[PDB]
């Protein structure tokens, strides 16, 4: 039918930048293209309707334009409360097709990750399973290599990572790597440590603990 190649996929801009999201159509769709803002966890909301008409309630910093088959969303002064993924959709021929989606984050100064190590809970060893959590609190940018060291020997493929959304205050992130093991295996070792590598660090940071010590 009609595709919608929305570019880019993800971008970063500090407070006050001029953001431009490009949405190229696949054929003639006239001025029947709209834009939507969707904050994480909630429902999409209309921003621009019919190519270049601002919706009621949307601030004057949002605007759209049409140049043939290309539709651009324009944010004059990017605000901190614009952290959301944007989509472009056409309604010229059924079905309506959405864009790929452009996630917008706020660029700030590089911050160092606060590393914490968590031993498993004794209320969990009673069930025959152990889990070691490595905390990376408030850091920017998002890229961070978390590798586990057991008895100073590099382990891998036994832990899952999870990163939050951009924080509403200090526009940073938070990561938690959970090394899932078992009571039959967690006690067959001694030293547990997670190594953190980040741009805000000069050398890799390591937080360790000896089992029972």
């Amino acid at each position: 039918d009609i595709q919608m190649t929305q570019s880019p996929s993800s971008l970063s801009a500090s407070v006050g930048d001029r953001v431009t999201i490009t949405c190229r159509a696949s054929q003639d769709v006239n001025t029947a293209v709209a834009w939507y803002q969707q904050k994480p966890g909630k429902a999409p909301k209309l921003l621009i309707y019919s190519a270049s008409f601002l919706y009621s309630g949307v601030p004057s910093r949002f605007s759209g334009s049409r140049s043939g088959t290309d539709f651009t969303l324009t944010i004059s002064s990017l605000q901190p409360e614009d952290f959301a993924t944007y989509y472009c959709q056409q309604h010229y021929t059924t079905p309506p097709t959405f864009g790929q989606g452009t996630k917008v984050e706020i660029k700030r100064t590089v911050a160092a990750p606060s590393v914490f190590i968590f031993p498993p809970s004794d209320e969990q060893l009673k069930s025959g399973t152990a889990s070691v959590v490595c905390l990376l609190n408030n850091f920017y940018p998002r890229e961070a290599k978390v590798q586990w060291k057991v008895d100073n020997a590099l382990x891998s493929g036994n832990s899952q990572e999870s990163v939050t959304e951009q924080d509403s205050k200090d526009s940073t992130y938070s990561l938690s790597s959970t090394l899932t093991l078992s009571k039959a295996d967690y006690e067959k070792h001694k030293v547990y440590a997670c190594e953190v590598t980040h741009q805000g660090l000069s050398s890799p940071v390591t937080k360790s603990f000896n089992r029972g010590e």
Binding site: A32, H91, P95, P96, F98, P119, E123, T180
Partner: protein, 214 residues
């Protein structure tokens, strides 16, 4: 005073059936087109079906044609989406919207979005475990092994919110979700204040308040 509310979703076996309702308030659905747009857990927006409640003209996406049925009722001002032969592909949050100005305003009003999980693993309540630290103090609760989404974790019954991070749920190899929710508090309050996480689970009817202290 224009709002759309969806209801009727939840966990469902593969190939099973599920009906979704979309009650509209603030306008009559007889004047507008009603749509159903789903969003896969992490992916974009996919249009499913459309209906014109005046005469019931229905157009469906080619990925749901023959399996899904959309219907309306002007006497109830409520739209319906009958979903059959459900697969894991259909696991998504199903929104419901309208077309204002007969299409000139596009999908202006959307619903709160109810999620439909299409799996076969039974529901399971989470196991909440504490995380004792050593403000260089940080504690949290491990919400491990539960099914399905979502779960709500608050601290100190909502009174503790400054510097709280609840990580998204990652799906373990055992098909069970798990996440942690930590907090950064001043270190001079580990034997004075009381830190309790409130892990509430509605699908499994689980309500745990595991106090965290070293």
């Amino acid at each position: 005073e224009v709002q759309l509310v969806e209801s009727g979703g939840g966990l469902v076996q593969p190939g099973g059936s599920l009906r979704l309702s979309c009650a509209a308030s603030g306008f009559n659905i007889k004047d507008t087109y009603i749509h159903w747009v789903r969003q896969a857990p992490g992916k974009g927006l996919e249009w499913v079906a459309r209906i014109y409640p005046t005469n019931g003209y229905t157009r469906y996406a080619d990925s749901v044609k023959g399996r899904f049925t959309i219907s309306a009722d002007t006497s109830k001002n409520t739209a319906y989406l009958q979903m059959n032969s459900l697969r894991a592909e259909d696991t998504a949050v199903y929104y419901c919207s309208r077309w204002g100005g007969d299409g000139f305003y596009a999908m202006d009003y959307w619903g709160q979005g109810t999620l439909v999980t299409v799996s076969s693993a039974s529901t399971k309540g989470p196991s909440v475990f504490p995380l004792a630290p050593s403000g260089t103090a940080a504690l949290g609760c491990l919400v491990k092994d539960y099914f399905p989404e979502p779960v709500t974790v608050s601290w100190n019954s909502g009174a503790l919110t400054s510097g709280v991070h609840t990580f998204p749920a990652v799906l373990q190899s055992s098909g069970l979700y798990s996440l942690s929710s930590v907090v950064t508090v001043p270190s001079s309050s580990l034997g004075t204040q009381t830190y309790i996480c409130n892990v509430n689970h509605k699908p499994s009817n689980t309500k745990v308040d595991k106090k965290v202290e070293p």
